[PDB]
Curated annotation (Swiss-Prot), chain A:
Swiss-Prot/TrEMBL site (Interaction with phosphoserine on interacting protein) positions: R63, R132
Residues where N6-acetyllysine is found: K10, K75
Name assigned to this protein: 14-3-3 protein zeta/delta
Annotated consequence of substituting S189A: On DNA damage, loss of MAPK8-mediated phosphorylation. Loss of binding ABL1. Attenuates ABL1-mediated apoptosis. No loss of interaction with BAX under stress conditions. Inhibits translocation of BAX to mitochondria
Listed GO MF terms: cadherin binding; DNA-binding transcription factor binding; identical protein binding; phosphoserine residue binding; protein domain specific binding; protein kinase binding; protein phosphatase binding; protein sequestering activity
UniProt effect for mutating S150L: Found in a patient with a neurodevelopmental disorder; uncertain significance
Pfam families for this protein: 14-3-3
GO CC terms of this entry: blood microparticle; cytoplasm; cytosol; extracellular exosome; extracellular space; focal adhesion; glutamatergic synapse; hippocampal mossy fiber to CA3 synapse
Biological processes annotated in GO: angiogenesis; cellular response to glucose starvation; ERK1 and ERK2 cascade; establishment of Golgi localization; Golgi reassembly; lung development; negative regulation of apoptotic process; negative regulation of innate immune response
Organism of provenance: Homo sapiens (Human)
UniProtKB/Swiss-Prot annotation, chain B:
Gene (name only): YWHAZ
Species assigned in the record: Homo sapiens (Human)
Official protein name in the record: 14-3-3 protein zeta/delta
GO molecular function list: cadherin binding; DNA-binding transcription factor binding; identical protein binding; phosphoserine residue binding; protein domain specific binding; protein kinase binding; protein phosphatase binding; protein sequestering activity
Subunit organization: Interacts with CDK16 and BSPRY. Interacts with WEE1 (C-terminal). Interacts with SAMSN1. Interacts with MLF1 (phosphorylated form); the interaction retains it in the cytoplasm. Interacts with Thr-phosphorylated ITGB2. Interacts with BCL2L11. Homodimer. Heterodimerizes with YWHAE. Homo- and heterodimerization is inhibited by phosphorylation on Ser-66. Interacts with FOXO4, NOXA1, SSH1 and ARHGEF2. Interacts with Pseudomonas aeruginosa exoS (unphosphorylated form). Interacts with BAX; the interaction occurs in the cytoplasm. (Microbial infection) Interacts with Epstein-Barr virus protein BPLF1 and TRIM25; leading to inhibition of the type-I IFN response.
InterPro entries listed in its UniProt record: 14-3-3, 14-3-3_CS, 14-3-3_dom_sf, 14-3-3_domain
CDD domains: 14-3-3_beta_zeta
PROSITE patterns in UniProt: 1433_1, 1433_2
Interaction with phosphoserine on interacting protein (site feature) positions: R64, R133
Modified how: The delta, brain-specific form differs from the zeta form in being phosphorylated. Phosphorylation on Ser-190 by MAPK8; promotes dissociation of BAX and translocation of BAX to mitochondria. Phosphorylated on Ser-66 by PKA and protein kinase C delta type catalytic subunit in a sphingosine-dependent fashion. Phosphorylation on Ser-66 by PKA; disrupts homodimerization and heterodimerization with YHAE and TP53.
Length: 243, 241
């Protein structure tokens, strides 16, 4: 504007994203973390975590709005129907922006800068998520193509994490959680879904001896969701966790 | 942006999308719709009036919560980090003032003048007192005295019309009482007038429990709120919804 290039230092940007979080202003938070990302430095686990939550909440709000409106779109007898149809489309657009914004960050910065496998797995999972959201809202011909960009990501994530990470690890567990949901809600393979969940859950249960006090609340919460899902698939406080 | 012809939305399509916005909790969209509707110059219907008030309570409510949250972090830091909390707080105060003002604007240039029945003038006069009161909540020394009095003089005029024209159990009269006492307590640090006003309003509505008939659950809801505030202020944390 007309400021003198006393821009915010990275440390300061992160202090703001935190402030923005406690103040329930996730647009601000996403913005602060997008900036930090763009500096090109590999993000610390804190920053990475912060970034993830920030966009979980931002994309999340729209997804809720899209589902409310897309529903109302269809509880219609005439003219009001396409009032809703357009509103939905405007929301789909907000969505695709946020999704593509994040997807960019993941391609141009986060995934290439990934040091240890744990981080690659992190960002690949993220990639599958936001490709998945595009898919949820994608057009007829595009969908099939979007939905397996989603799957390729989740998949590579899965493979690395099996070779390289403990099953009690929140990242591997959160990946499991969202992949099994992918198979279920996106591919309608409740069979492949249930397999992923149970295996993931069991292998973690197998090694609860190994789960550390520091990962404990997070991992067990994800395990609990995996298991709560399995009951349902047989017979969202996830927005505050990065995994 | 500029690439659109004046085939835009009429009052009905605007209102119809206000309601959708509300269902999808996009109170910004909703305030945009109702502002547009208000601006077309006609007196708002009751349905419309409500959509307007809801949308802006929500829009400004969000910023007020944010301000309070950041404002506390500022003080629980008795310290280079405090400066960032302070500046974020100021950025927020800005969003706040814009919102209050372009509402206060719709009230002077449209809503209050268009007000025909006594009941309507009370609603928008309280609304005026309400948003001057949010201004008052964040104002600095110099501007404050007058913002506060803008809030009071509005609350006041609304008060006398409501007592002279409506029933003690009329939720608007009841709701005016609620927010006027909050003014006194929180903005004027006049706790005895606040408590006295809350109690009176409550007592006179107690008297005429004749006047129902299902509004009703709208009347006793505010009555319960007046009691809570009265309890809070006289015993040893007020609510925001």
């Amino acid at each position: 504007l007309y400021k003198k290039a006393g821009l915010m230092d990275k440390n300061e940007l992160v202090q703001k994203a935190k402030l923005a979080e406690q103040a329930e202003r996730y647009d601000d938070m996403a913005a602060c973390m997008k900036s930090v990302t763009e500096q090109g430095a590999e993000l610390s686990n804190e920053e990475r975590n912060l970034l993830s939550v920030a966009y979980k909440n931002v994309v999340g709000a729209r997804r809720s709005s899209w589902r409310v409106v897309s529903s109302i779109e269809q509880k219609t007898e005439e003219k009001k129907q396409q009032m809703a149809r357009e509103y939905r489309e405007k929301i789909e657009t907000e969505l695709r922006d946020i999704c593509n914004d994040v997807l960019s960050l993941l391609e141009k910065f986060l995934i290439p800068n990934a040091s240890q496998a744990e981080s690659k797995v992190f960002y690949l999972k993220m990639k599958g998520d936001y490709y998945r959201y595009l898919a949820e809202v994608a057009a007829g011909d595009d969908k099939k193509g979007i939905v397996d960009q989603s799957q390729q990501a989740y998949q590579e994530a899965f493979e690395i994490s099996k070779k390289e990470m403990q099953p009690t690890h929140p990242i591997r567990l959160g990946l499991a959680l969202n992949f099994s949901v992918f198979y279920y809600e996106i591919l309608n393979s409740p069979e492949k879904a249930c397999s992923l969940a149970k295996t993931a859950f069991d292998e973690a249960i197998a090694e609860l001896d190994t789960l550390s006090e520091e990962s404990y609340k997070d991992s067990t919460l994800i395990m609990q969701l995996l298991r709560d899902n399995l009951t349902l698939w047989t017979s969202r406080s996830m927005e505050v966790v990065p995994y």
